[PDB]
Amino acid sequence: VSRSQRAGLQFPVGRIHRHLKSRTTSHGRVGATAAVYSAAILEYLTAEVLELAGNASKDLKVKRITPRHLQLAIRGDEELDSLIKATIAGGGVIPHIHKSLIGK
Amino acid sequence: AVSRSQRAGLQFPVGRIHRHLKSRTTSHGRVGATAAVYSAAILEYLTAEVLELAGNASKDLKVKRITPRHLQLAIRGDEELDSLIKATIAGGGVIPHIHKSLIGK
Amino acid sequence: PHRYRPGTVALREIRRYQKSTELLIRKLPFQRLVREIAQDFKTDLRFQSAAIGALQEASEAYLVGLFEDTNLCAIHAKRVTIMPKDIQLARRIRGERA
Amino acid sequence: PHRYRPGTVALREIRRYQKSTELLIRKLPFQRLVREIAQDFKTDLRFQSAAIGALQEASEAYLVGLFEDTNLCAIHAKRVTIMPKDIQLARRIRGER
Amino acid sequence: RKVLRDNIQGITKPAIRRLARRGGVKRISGLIYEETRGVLKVFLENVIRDAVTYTEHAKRKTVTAMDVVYALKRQGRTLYGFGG
Amino acid sequence: NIQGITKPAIRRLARRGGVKRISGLIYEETRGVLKVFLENVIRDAVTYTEHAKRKTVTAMDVVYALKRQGRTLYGFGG
Amino acid sequence: RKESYSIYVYKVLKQVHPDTGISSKAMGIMNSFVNDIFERIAGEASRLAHYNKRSTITSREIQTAVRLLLPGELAKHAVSEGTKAVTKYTSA
Amino acid sequence: RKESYSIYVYKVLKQVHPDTGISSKAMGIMNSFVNDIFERIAGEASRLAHYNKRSTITSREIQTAVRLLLPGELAKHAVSEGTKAVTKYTSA
DNA sequence: ATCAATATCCACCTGCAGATTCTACCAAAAGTGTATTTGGAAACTGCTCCATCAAAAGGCATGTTCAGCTGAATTCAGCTGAACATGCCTTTTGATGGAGCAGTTTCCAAATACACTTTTGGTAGAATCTGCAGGTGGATATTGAT
DNA sequence: ATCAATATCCACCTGCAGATTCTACCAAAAGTGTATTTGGAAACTGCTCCATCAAAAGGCATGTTCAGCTGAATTCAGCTGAACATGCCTTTTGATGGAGCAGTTTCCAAATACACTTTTGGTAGAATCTGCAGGTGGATATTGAT
């Protein structure tokens, strides 16, 4: 009977609790459900990225998601883009060419 | 009976700083006897560096008491404090500067 | 009758304001602006006076700093008049949104 | 005899390289450079290949993004050619100063 | 109470000109004043939204200067001189 | 060594960046900037290495360094 | 010996996209991603509890931390999922 | 009730500028500066400990944290002052 | 070049607002003990780095030619700065009531802390397979030129 | 927009191999069950300090007029940087075998956490000094017309 299965989550509630406990503080304590909540939103967010990333790969008729697909998915979405100003190694950039630079 | 600050030759309060380190980290977190000392030392050195330059500034304006304007002059004028302190000093203003293109030919 | 030429009073004002440190937005209207925006988030909020003091100092710090960058963009376009597209170029490069 | 007009090939390379994701700096010259720079901080260092690879990735991501902002400054000035004052302005507004 | 609306226009054309002067600006286009108001409003929304989030969490009805100082640190606009 | 970062390479980077026409002085400018970049990151990386009493800069030491300059990198251990 | 979120990322992939696989470099990205958001959420939550002279990071800290960290809409849904997973888990 | 760094900032002030006072707003700034730098050190130091699977924060952590946060010349001098005070302290 | 018209200093001046000192309890820093780990400190793995060699294969460096872009010069509509008259609304001084922080107290529901039992996730080798990168040849884009 | 002749680009389909995924066991978590702790929500309450209100007055915002000079448009030609097909020097790569040395592990001295009971340093208001904020008035620019 595991806490992830109890919470109806794929993500590892037990481990997330053990990591949280190691963040704060000497004094510190960690509620039962905090681990559950955290694991819940980490799972939701990776589902959202993988959802969009999956579409990007289908729209190129390939089966395997690559870092390019993660980059296209993330940059092409206003909110994921805001949230993730990391550098996605091997993802490249979104194709874009300024109007003024096109031939007349 | 002597205080740890005194024992380290410091003005900044070693005990208090040792007590804020315990307070903030880690979980199972341990703080060494000399982590507090070393910390009080560099807090005090940095305070000295800032107050040295601020004080010069207010002498350059023939006044006796340091104001936030002086702190701002000191920090912006020092290449390294300016890099360290990217914060906004309430009351500070800015360093007088006018680009050349704007000056009347 | 005496007229300073266009731009002379402007340089006097840069010198004046760069030398001073007082808030440049009037307090009451700014306090009002804050309470209007705050209220569109959560009704029945109060404010410590220092909370509004904090918002105003940050807000003017931010805007003064943004006109410095805006001014560099205008000068880069070999102009002397800052325009909306300068403020937009500044903010794009600053990573701010839009 | 066949020639493309100035800019035509240029636009072709933009399209190609915004399409691809491979490193655009050559690995070995770059490794040489990283190691030389590092030598000034600590001597006889060794590098995980993964670490050299992270540095290059970060570097090229940084330069490419800086070229985007440099182009914007160039276009702001009614040009089409980036120049060092374009890189200088971008780095200034960025706070790298 | 009384209804609060159009208060952004309380940031007058002379206040914006003064702020630009401290920023070293010599000449201002006539379209700057409404841009600035728009940009100030997005600034304040973001800071006040976060500040109020700190207030609600702590179950208070009063936004404190600490709520504002933490909000600004989050936004990477750290402020000195109110922090206690 | 910095000169080993060649012109066609800087050309390629700019192309990915959307640049159409490149002034002849951009190349020496770009190296000065890339050099300030690597110096700032590597110094921090090596500082993490020395702390760990190692002689080998790990990918984590760079990922940590990049996180400190605010250039977070996904893909190499965090 | 060295743990990862690979296993669980792949499990999530198979729900939203049973058809799809993921390359190891992409899996690396998702890892860096989950570690990063975890550390941001965790950081803000500790901070919150400290600002309020508390000691236990509860799901209340996490939730506020999410409101502060996630853009609205991503934040709405993320608040749902957490409220969901938590109520469902406290039902025995 | 509410602690502060004021009597220490004041002490140090008298050392460098025996003639000079400090208005209370300037002291507010100074207090914000000290608490800020303290947090950055402590932060960087706890993180250092984490990356090396160590649970104690020693002067050796603090010293690296200072090399990471402080630029160039300020760092060289702060390290000397910290080293000096520690070896003075560890002289019983 | 000189005035004429303003703006800017720079120094001198006097009590007010705000600073430097002065005075008492409380939390916290200190010196004692005793009980627990932490993380060097050595000694030995195996990874996984560096340094080779050694091709062929790119990819760069080089020089020429000129398209076309940048910068300079010229012009002018009208936008924006300066000044002025007018009077409103912010500022300032000072109260009022009381909403709602924040300081104390109790004290269960919620945590840590074991100590054991039982499971899962990580590692290291098997077992296919996505798609890189290669071919063709059809249509397109580009550029010269009645 | 058609005529031509490049070259580019874009499908469709192809075949292996470098990566992926699926298979099979061993430890460190993850889950249980018990026994304490404890932190933080109550439920009162003392008491800042926040929202109003009033009221007077001048520091400023508003709006208009007028024209100086700036930004935007246009033309131009010198020359800078793109395109090119040439010629060769450097990077790529792919085992090999040595080895430097991360990453274990096993071991105890030093360094840390507790813990009951000291002593003192620093905070909160009272109590006194006193810089300096701007008020004023002339000497020293600074600006702009002529």
Numbering used by the authors:
A (entry chain G): 17 to 120
B (entry chain C): 16 to 120
C (entry chain E): 38 to 135
D (entry chain A): 38 to 134
E (entry chain F): 19 to 102
F (entry chain B): 25 to 102
G (entry chain H), H (entry chain D): 33 to 124
Sentences from the paper on this structure:
In the nucleosome, two copies each of histones H2A, H2B, H3 and H4 form the histone octamer, which wraps about 150 base-pairs of DNA on its surface. Among the histone variants, H2A.Z is known as a universal nucleosome component and has been suggested to function as a regulator of transcription. H2A.Z is known to accumulate around transcription start sites (TSSs), which frequently contain nucleosome-depleted regions (NDRs), especially in transcriptionally active genes. Intriguingly, in mouse trophoblast stem cells, the H2A.Z nucleosomes around TSS regions convert from homotypic (H2A.Z/H2A.Z) to heterotypic (H2A.Z/H2A) after DNA replication.
As the H2A.Z nucleosome with a histone H3 variant, H3.3, at a TSS reportedly has different physical properties from the H2A.Z nucleosome with the canoncal H3.1, we also tested whether the incorporation of H3.3 affects the structure of the H2A.Z molecule in nucleosomes. To do so, we crystallized the homotypic H2A.Z and heterotypic H2A.Z/H2A nucleosomes with H3.3 instead of H3.1, and determined their structures at 2.93 Å and 2.35 Å, respectively. We then found that the H3.3 incorporation minimally affected the H2A.Z L1 loop structures in both the homotypic H2A.Z and heterotypic H2A.Z/H2A nucleosomes. The stability of the homotypic H2A.Z nucleosome with H3.3 was the same as that with H3.1. Therefore, we concluded that the H3.3 incorporation does not directly affect the structure and stability of the H2A.Z nucleosome. The diffraction dataset of the homotypic H2A.Z nucleosomes with H3.3 was collected with an X-ray wavelength of 1.0 Å at −173°C on the BL41XU beamline at SPring-8. The Ramachandran plot of the homotypic H2A.Z nucleosome with H3.3 showed 95.8% of the residues in the favoured region, 4.2% of the residues in the allowed region and no outlying residues.
